[PDB]
Amino acid sequence: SKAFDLVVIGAGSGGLEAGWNAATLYGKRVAVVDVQTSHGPPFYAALGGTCVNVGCVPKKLMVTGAQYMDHLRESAGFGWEFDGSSVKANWKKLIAAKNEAVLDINKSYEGMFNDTEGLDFFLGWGSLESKNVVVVRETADPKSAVKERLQADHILLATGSWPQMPAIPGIEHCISSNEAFYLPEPPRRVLTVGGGFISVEFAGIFNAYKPPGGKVTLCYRNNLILRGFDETIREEVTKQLTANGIEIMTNENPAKVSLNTDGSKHVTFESGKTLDVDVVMMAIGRIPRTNDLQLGNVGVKLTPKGGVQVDEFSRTNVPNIYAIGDITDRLMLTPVAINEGAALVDTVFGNKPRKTDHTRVASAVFSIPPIGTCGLIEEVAAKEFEKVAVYMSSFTPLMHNISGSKYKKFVAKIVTNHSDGTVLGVHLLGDGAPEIIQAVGVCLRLNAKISDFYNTIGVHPTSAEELCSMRTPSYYYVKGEKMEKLP
Amino acid sequence: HMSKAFDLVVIGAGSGGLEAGWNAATLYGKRVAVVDVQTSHGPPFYAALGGTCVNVGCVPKKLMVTGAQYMDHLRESAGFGWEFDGSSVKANWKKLIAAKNEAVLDINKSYEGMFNDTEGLDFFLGWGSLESKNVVVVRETADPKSAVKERLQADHILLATGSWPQMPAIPGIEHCISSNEAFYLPEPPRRVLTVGGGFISVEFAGIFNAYKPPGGKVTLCYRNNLILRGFDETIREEVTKQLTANGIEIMTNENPAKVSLNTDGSKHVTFESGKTLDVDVVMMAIGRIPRTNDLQLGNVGVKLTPKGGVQVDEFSRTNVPNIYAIGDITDRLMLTPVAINEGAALVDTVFGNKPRKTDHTRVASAVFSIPPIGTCGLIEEVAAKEFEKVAVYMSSFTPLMHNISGSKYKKFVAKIVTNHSDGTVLGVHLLGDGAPEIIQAVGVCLRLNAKISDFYNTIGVHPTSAEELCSMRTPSYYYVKGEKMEKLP
Ligand SMILES: Cc1cc2nc3c(=O)[nH]c(=O)nc-3n(C[C@H](O)[C@H](O)[C@H](O)COP(=O)(O)OP(=O)(O)OC[C@H]3O[C@@H](n4cnc5c(N)ncnc54)[C@H](O)[C@@H]3O)c2cc1C
Ligand SMILES: Cc1cc2nc3c(=O)[nH]c(=O)nc-3n(C[C@H](O)[C@H](O)[C@H](O)COP(=O)(O)OP(=O)(O)OC[C@H]3O[C@@H](n4cnc5c(N)ncnc54)[C@H](O)[C@@H]3O)c2cc1C
Ligand SMILES: [Br-]
Ligand SMILES: [Br-]
Ligand SMILES: [Br-]
Ligand code: NA
């Protein structure tokens, strides 16, 4: 039995930021619990969190790998010649390189714990025994053997989220992104289920690494993928994914999955349509990971949606117990979880309360081609402001007229409060969009106006300079209604 | 045949001249004439309708750098599992140039159509010069004795003829080319010396290095100790290493003294040190000078600076009331978006009743080296001369993807330079893939007087290189009244 200022359940993005800051900045005594010291089966996430182990870090590596299918083809337009029939994509090599990079990060976090005063790692499953006692056990079963009892002045819940699996017959024959990271072979035919960024990103990954004769299908239960993103970009990325060979089935939803005699999967949709694939990857959502924590022992209140309820300072209803990151079911992004954890520790252990700003958070989708975005989409702005202007620029860049990928239109949109020119949102589709958007996130914190963008001198030639060339709105929303001219 | 009269006559249909001309005609209803020497790209005069950027500048060079980047992509693809017959790879320079030529010519034709279509915006082909305060003469050649094609009466005259490569007066200079000729080489050189330490030499070194035939070698020489003067010194040193790591030989403290032809027709370069180098092409890229000689400025008394540019005030006005100058002819910042900004500001002031001067500070710009540079604002040694206390925030590391690609020499560098007395960001300097795209919105930030805390409070986009700009809270080191030191005293 051991005594700590702060015990963190979950060695993830937010949990490690909070623990390291509490220990090194404020000299506190910190314990951090996670169920696994390195990535992969059986529990997938591990020391470092979901992003490090089965998330942003490995998927970005795999999307980078998938982009070479485009680079090799497009090199031809610039004079590069080689034997195209000799090209093959070695998925096993990709997975091995990704595994080595992730494991290196796991080991680095191990040394961090070993090297840092007041920062201790405990392996196992943490749950709430009492208001000031975290118990660590051998498995997720609350009856498994106690390994540690950690008394804590402060408890931080930071267990992240988990893939949501729909309650359909045969759901057990589907995988999630967790298993996709470790497939022994690239699937020849795969269905990715869902319209969100994980489904879209993995569609592009599988599309590049598929063996000859392969086919990637993405299905989504409503009419247009990537809800919550700019509508122009949702339509365009649909078009550009299709142009690269991915089939988009909208208004379709699996009703059941069954096993074929050859090991493949027979999917039946609610519409009656059927599809045989080697892999069905469910990517319909991620839900807060709250079940193993025994929040009923202490009475931590959940929201109707299942997140741990928190105030703006990450405090639960139970004094001394806090929650940050995906478990609060708000913005499920690693930099947000990090920011929340740092704000929390500054509030609790320093003399300055700090709350995370969840507006104007820049983010990206590493689709091929990718999305970068920060701030409000125009239909959300139109409900908040009487007068909204949308500035739009959309064209295929010169290099893709030469590369032969003429379908790769770059889209740049700026959404303003037309009453005073304030930029409310910026939405980008095309090569470089995640890099372009970062400093736009800084601009939105300086209450940048559209005229601040267009009076800035461009860097030429770039895609980004499009953001500084838009003077005249393409159209407007007045009292919520879209119109080409002001009334 | 009668002369034609205009509110504004623009000499030079380039980046700045076309912005001014189009804006005056379409925004303010003025009658505009624009003069250029050629309607499409290439020899004999290289620049043409559209300007130096369009024809023999930013636009073609970026396409060629993009082509050159595939040498890296093809090799780096193997770390991610891509397999193909490496022995079959060839870089076909003739296809690259043919593709570039067709793209540039498409732009030429579209500008041709703009003039045909637009009321009050007329194009005249030939060589423009100043005869008097209100008459521009258009002649068949740069020779002021050549035949007169038109006389253009002008209430206002805009000088926007750009710049031209400078060639040193060494024996055998006739055996050398400039970037103009580089854009049209029939074959890629097996061995090439690029002379100069500035961005054009560095960028062409990268292009030639990727398209060189078997057994080729690219050498860049520079007469001083470190290439890319004016850029961040950490980045100057790193780009030197990364060019070297991709097989480019960088000769610093070396300068050609003479060039002669070997008996096989290759170029024998003797440096001032007595070193010798045999190459197939010597490309001089030691500077560009403003194109003033052919304008006959003596006819009206337009003053030049000691340097040679047309002297202008902050509003682009020469010492002659109704004669203005913008762009490279003013021999200042030679960048296409600065020329465009100056043109638009001038026209808003003269014809729009909305006076405006171009801000020449905090201009974002790029070098399309491999890998590239993006920068905006002051380098730290300049800031330390002006500010009592300067802080430097610095992140440098090989990104994870290049530990898998095999190009471990590709360190990404991000530096923020601040006035530490109040946190204001004075400059941001980037080296690495995507740096020119990242830096653009940084330029908007500096125009808004962003402080380091504005960057640090912004939540990162992960995983990106750009997010390093939003993760730096503690200075790596300082300058205190000019003196570099890890810690404040
Ligand atoms: C495929 C995929 C791709 C993503 N890509 C991106 C991206 O590009 N950018 C981005 O910003 N975000 C991305 N995300 C989201 C990002 O991964 C999460 O937002 C982030 O990891 C959440 O941080 P956190 O601190 O809430 O928890 P996590 O980082 O998930 O860490 C929670 C930890 O808790 C441990 N744990 C759980 N229960 C217990 C328990 N009872 N006891 C002990 N330990 C426990 C888990 O093992 C895990 O290590 C991606 C997610 C996925 C699934
Ligand atoms: C190799 C190279 C690469 C470059 N890359 C970049 C880059 O990536 N980014 C960037 O921002 N800048 C770049 N530049 C610089 C950019 O090209 C110039 O800054 C910009 O074009 C200058 O614009 P301007 O309006 O001053 O003149 P220009 O665009 O040069 O136009 C001047 C025009 O005047 C014409 N002309 C000259 N004399 C006469 C006359 N007597 N009568 C009639 N017409 C005449 C010329 O034919 C020419 O078309 C590059 C330059 C070079 C050489
Ligand atoms: Br929808
Ligand atoms: Br060739
Ligand atoms: Br700060
Ligand atoms: Na769905």
Side-chain angles (χ1 to χ4, degrees):
Chain A
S1 199
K2 328 196 170 182
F4 292 94
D5 292 297
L6 174 67
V7 186
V8 180
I9 307 201
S13 295
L16 287 178
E17 182 76 0
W20 167 277
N21 286 14
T24 68
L25 308 183
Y26 295 95
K28 297 298 133 184
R29 227 186 281 161
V30 181
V32 183
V33 193
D34 211 295
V35 307
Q36 217 169 261
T37 62
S38 63
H39 69 92
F43 302 150
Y44 293 98
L47 176 55
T50 297
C51 178
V52 166
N53 288 283
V54 283
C56 346
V57 171
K59 77 94 179 289
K60 176 67 175 293
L61 289 182
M62 300 165 66
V63 170
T64 294
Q67 290 164 352
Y68 289 106
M69 180 174 68
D70 289 26
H71 286 317
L72 295 180
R73 172 173 54 78
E74 291 170 349
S75 73
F78 295 82
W80 291 87
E81 314 176 330
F82 54 88
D83 179 3
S85 82
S86 78
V87 175
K88 83 149 271 163
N90 193 323
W91 171 262
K92 285 195 201 65
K93 175 98 168 258
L94 179 68
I95 302 303
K98 176 268 297 182
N99 286 344
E100 170 182 21
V102 173
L103 185 57
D104 280 357
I105 297 167
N106 294 137
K107 303 168 165 183
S108 190
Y109 277 127
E110 187 186 6
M112 181 190 79
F113 275 101
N114 295 336
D115 288 356
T116 305
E117 294 180 35
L119 180 59
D120 282 290
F121 175 81
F122 293 95
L123 177 62
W125 301 75
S127 54
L128 296 207
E129 189 164 90
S130 40
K131 189 155 167 335
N132 296 106
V133 173
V134 163
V135 47
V136 177
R137 301 183 189 265
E138 282 265 347
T139 80
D141 198 335
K143 92 202 275 98
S144 57
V146 169
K147 302 185 67 181
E148 308 285 334
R149 204 175 265 82
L150 315 171
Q151 44 220 19
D153 294 5
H154 305 274
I155 306 182
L156 176 54
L157 307 174
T159 50
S161 57
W162 198 247
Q164 182 188 340
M165 300 293 276
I168 62 177
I171 185 55
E172 62 275 4
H173 290 95
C174 301
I175 68 162
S176 72
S177 54
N178 284 343
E179 292 79 18
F181 285 107
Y182 300 95
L183 289 170
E185 301 290 343
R188 192 164 164 277
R189 299 160 306 173
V190 51
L191 174 65
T192 68
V193 182
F197 77 102
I198 294 186
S199 186
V200 168
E201 284 172 355
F202 266 98
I205 291 158
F206 294 132
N207 182 50
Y209 283 90
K210 70 190 177 306
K215 186 67 177 178
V216 176
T217 304
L218 182 152
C219 66
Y220 174 53
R221 67 192 304 160
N222 299 132
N223 195 68
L224 175 66
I225 66 179
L226 284 167
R227 256 185 196 182
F229 291 89
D230 171 283
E231 189 184 271
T232 306
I233 287 173
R234 293 163 69 187
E235 297 172 349
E236 256 313 307
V237 70
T238 296
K239 193 176 179 290
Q240 301 189 28
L241 292 166
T242 298
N244 201 24
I246 298 170
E247 178 152 272
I248 310 292
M249 293 175 66
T250 49
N251 306 291
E252 301 284 343
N253 194 36
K256 62 184 154 187
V257 185
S258 59
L259 214 223
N260 290 327
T261 62
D262 62 5
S264 66
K265 278 69 203 185
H266 187 67
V267 180
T268 300
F269 293 85
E270 288 173 17
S271 63
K273 301 173 194 185
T274 59
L275 186 71
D276 290 317
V277 295
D278 303 308
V279 166
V280 182
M281 192 192 84
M282 283 283 178
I284 60 160
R286 291 178 57 84
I287 50 183
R289 205 160 166 200
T290 59
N291 272 16
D292 312 324
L293 282 168
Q294 309 309 321
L295 304 169
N297 284 345
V298 306
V300 181
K301 170 102 172 263
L302 309 180
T303 71
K305 334 264 193 65
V308 175
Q309 192 166 346
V310 291
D311 65 3
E312 304 170 292
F313 293 91
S314 304
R315 291 183 300 242
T316 69
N317 63 311
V318 182
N320 110 101
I321 306 185
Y322 322 97
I324 64 167
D326 290 1
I327 201 179
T328 66
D329 203 17
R330 203 154 178 204
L331 289 183
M332 292 200 175
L333 297 168
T334 272
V336 177
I338 292 171
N339 194 265
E340 289 177 343
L344 171 76
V345 163
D346 284 350
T347 295
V348 165
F349 296 118
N351 203 352
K352 229 146 197 281
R354 269 262 334 290
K355 44 193 214 224
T356 291
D357 176 12
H358 302 87
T359 75
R360 304 164 294 169
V361 174
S363 72
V365 181
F366 283 94
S367 50
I368 296 159
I371 295 170
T373 179
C374 179
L376 304 176
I377 63 175
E378 66 206 51
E379 53 269 58
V380 170
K383 285 120 199 72
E384 275 182 61
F385 296 95
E386 181 187 338
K387 308 205 58 131
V388 172
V390 179
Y391 300 70
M392 181 161 66
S393 168
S394 187
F395 57 76
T396 295
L398 183 48
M399 73 144 287
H400 283 309
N401 286 321
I402 293 182
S403 77
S405 296
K406 291 170 163 61
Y407 57 88
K408 281 175 181 196
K409 295 205 229 299
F410 196 92
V411 184
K413 295 183 60 189
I414 308 181
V415 179
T416 65
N417 175 0
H418 194 50
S419 292
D420 65 358
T422 300
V423 175
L424 310 175
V426 178
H427 314 281
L428 306 172
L429 172 74
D431 303 319
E435 300 287 356
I436 297 161
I437 200 71
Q438 177 68 87
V440 174
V442 180
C443 291
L444 267 49
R445 313 203 68 82
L446 304 156
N447 272 317
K449 301 187 183 298
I450 182 67
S451 61
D452 297 313
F453 277 87
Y454 63 62
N455 293 333
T456 300
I457 292 182
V459 188
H460 179 69
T462 64
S463 286
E465 70 178 306
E466 286 311 307
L467 288 176
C468 303
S469 267
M470 287 185 281
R471 263 218 315 113
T472 305
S474 294
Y475 56 88
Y476 303 85
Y477 291 79
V478 186
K479 309 176 217 262
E481 81 162 335
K482 183 172 126 73
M483 67 184 54
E484 166 125 5
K485 314 281 244 320
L486 282 185
Chain B
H1 200 235
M2 309 307 277
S3 67
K4 329 281 205 296
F6 303 90
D7 295 298
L8 172 72
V9 168
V10 178
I11 306 185
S15 292
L18 286 176
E19 181 76 9
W22 170 266
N23 282 14
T26 61
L27 297 179
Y28 298 113
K30 313 314 283 184
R31 285 179 174 211
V32 186
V34 187
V35 189
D36 210 298
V37 306
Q38 223 170 257
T39 60
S40 67
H41 66 94
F45 301 137
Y46 290 102
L49 180 51
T52 292
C53 181
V54 164
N55 289 282
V56 282
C58 347
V59 169
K61 81 90 187 293
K62 170 71 180 281
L63 298 181
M64 293 162 67
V65 171
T66 293
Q69 291 170 344
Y70 289 110
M71 190 173 62
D72 290 26
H73 285 321
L74 302 197
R75 170 175 56 81
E76 293 173 347
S77 75
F80 294 86
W82 290 88
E83 305 173 345
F84 52 96
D85 182 4
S87 94
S88 68
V89 168
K90 278 135 161 293
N92 186 328
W93 166 268
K94 298 187 163 75
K95 283 198 274 202
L96 176 75
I97 300 303
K100 175 272 291 184
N101 283 349
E102 183 62 19
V104 170
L105 180 63
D106 279 342
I107 296 162
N108 296 143
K109 286 176 185 176
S110 73
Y111 278 136
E112 260 206 305
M114 174 194 84
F115 282 104
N116 294 174
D117 291 336
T118 300
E119 198 194 12
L121 182 59
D122 291 9
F123 175 78
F124 297 85
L125 176 70
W127 290 80
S129 65
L130 271 40
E131 177 167 85
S132 53
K133 179 174 61 80
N134 301 106
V135 175
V136 169
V137 185
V138 177
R139 290 181 190 273
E140 293 183 352
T141 75
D143 187 335
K145 288 173 317 226
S146 63
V148 169
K149 310 182 71 182
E150 309 273 356
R151 279 183 160 83
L152 312 176
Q153 319 166 46
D155 272 1
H156 303 271
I157 297 166
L158 176 55
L159 311 177
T161 53
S163 57
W164 200 250
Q166 178 171 41
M167 298 296 271
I170 59 178
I173 189 63
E174 66 274 14
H175 307 310
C176 304
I177 67 166
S178 70
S179 57
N180 288 335
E181 291 81 19
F183 284 106
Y184 298 94
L185 289 167
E187 292 180 334
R190 184 183 141 237
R191 305 156 295 176
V192 50
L193 177 67
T194 68
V195 184
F199 75 101
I200 291 167
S201 181
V202 166
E203 285 172 354
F204 267 95
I207 289 163
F208 289 133
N209 185 51
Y211 285 84
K212 65 192 188 302
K217 185 67 182 190
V218 171
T219 303
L220 179 157
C221 65
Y222 177 50
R223 68 189 306 161
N224 300 130
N225 189 233
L226 177 62
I227 67 177
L228 282 167
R229 279 193 173 180
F231 293 84
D232 173 276
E233 186 179 80
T234 306
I235 288 176
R236 290 170 68 196
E237 294 166 335
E238 266 302 317
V239 121
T240 298
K241 289 175 168 59
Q242 303 187 23
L243 296 173
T244 299
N246 209 21
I248 295 155
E249 169 92 3
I250 288 150
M251 297 175 67
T252 47
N253 302 301
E254 299 284 351
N255 192 40
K258 64 175 176 187
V259 179
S260 58
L261 300 183
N262 297 317
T263 60
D264 67 4
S266 62
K267 277 67 169 211
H268 186 75
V269 182
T270 309
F271 299 87
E272 294 171 13
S273 69
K275 295 193 182 53
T276 65
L277 183 64
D278 292 316
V279 300
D280 304 289
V281 168
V282 179
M283 193 196 82
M284 291 282 177
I286 62 153
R288 293 176 55 83
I289 51 184
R291 272 178 106 163
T292 50
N293 289 293
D294 308 321
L295 289 170
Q296 312 295 122
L297 297 170
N299 287 346
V300 296
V302 167
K303 294 202 173 84
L304 302 180
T305 67
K307 269 308 300 184
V310 173
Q311 189 174 270
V312 291
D313 69 6
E314 297 181 309
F315 292 87
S316 304
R317 298 181 296 215
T318 72
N319 63 300
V320 180
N322 65 310
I323 303 182
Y324 322 100
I326 66 182
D328 294 4
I329 202 183
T330 67
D331 196 15
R332 199 173 176 174
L333 295 182
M334 295 194 180
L335 296 167
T336 270
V338 180
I340 288 168
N341 193 265
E342 288 178 323
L346 167 73
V347 162
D348 282 346
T349 303
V350 170
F351 300 111
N353 323 329
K354 35 172 91 84
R356 216 176 93 222
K357 50 188 169 166
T358 291
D359 179 8
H360 301 268
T361 77
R362 302 165 297 176
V363 181
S365 73
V367 179
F368 284 92
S369 54
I370 297 177
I373 299 172
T375 178
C376 180
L378 302 177
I379 60 180
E380 65 201 55
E381 55 265 63
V382 168
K385 275 167 168 41
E386 298 177 20
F387 294 92
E388 181 178 338
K389 294 159 149 208
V390 165
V392 175
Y393 304 78
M394 167 166 160
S395 176
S396 187
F397 59 91
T398 303
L400 176 57
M401 90 148 273
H402 285 307
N403 286 315
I404 283 88
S405 78
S407 297
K408 290 169 189 232
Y409 58 91
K410 286 185 180 184
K411 263 171 178 207
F412 199 95
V413 185
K415 298 175 65 177
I416 299 174
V417 175
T418 69
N419 175 358
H420 193 57
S421 292
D422 69 350
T424 299
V425 178
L426 301 181
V428 174
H429 311 286
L430 307 172
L431 170 62
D433 295 324
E437 299 288 349
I438 299 166
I439 201 76
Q440 174 72 89
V442 171
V444 186
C445 292
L446 275 49
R447 184 172 163 289
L448 287 170
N449 302 306
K451 309 180 197 77
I452 180 71
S453 61
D454 297 314
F455 281 84
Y456 182 73
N457 290 337
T458 298
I459 293 177
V461 188
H462 179 69
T464 61
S465 294
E467 67 177 316
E468 300 291 321
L469 294 180
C470 295
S471 310
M472 288 187 300
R473 135 78 79 191
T474 297
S476 300
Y477 56 92
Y478 300 86
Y479 289 84
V480 178
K481 197 78 226 93
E483 185 184 7
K484 181 167 174 275
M485 58 185 65
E486 161 170 77
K487 301 288 206 276
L488 288 176

